[PDB]
Amino acid sequence: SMEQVAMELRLTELTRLLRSVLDQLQDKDPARIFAQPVSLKEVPDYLDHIKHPMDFATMRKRLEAQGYKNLHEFEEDFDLIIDNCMKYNARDTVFYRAAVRLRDQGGVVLRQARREVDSIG
Numbered sequence: 001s002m003e004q005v006a007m008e009l010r011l012t013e014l015t016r017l018l019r020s021v022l023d024q025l026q027d028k029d030p031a032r033i034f035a036q037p038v039s040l041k042e043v044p045d046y047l048d049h050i051k052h053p054m055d056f057a058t059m060r061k062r063l064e065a066q067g068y069k070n071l072h073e074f075e076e077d078f079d080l081i082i083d084n085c086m087k088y089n090a091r092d093t094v095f096y097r098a099a100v101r102l103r104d105q106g107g108v109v110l111r112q113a114r115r116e117v118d119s120i121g
Helices: 002-027 056-064 071-088 094-120
Strands: none
Touching: 002 056, 002 071, 002 094, 056 071, 071 094
């Protein structure tokens, strides 16, 4: 149908916008603390602590599979990254502190993407 393709022309376009948004958030992690999943080989007990791991490379696999139906879904994954970190790691660590930093620097980019999505469609 022509109505099916139009929703596809929109999902495609949403996805173009989230790649920009992701790229911009990834930039706020120059240390690449959040760039790959936590290794179970290096942290065997991780899954005893964290029930839903997440990382920028996982979010990107899903993003290119057009797997984000809206901005809320994408926001949940990004917040997982932050929130997983701040539970596993203590306050005085470099890991926890990079999460706080990424969160604060994220919310600007996210504030304006919510307006670009609402504005566009």
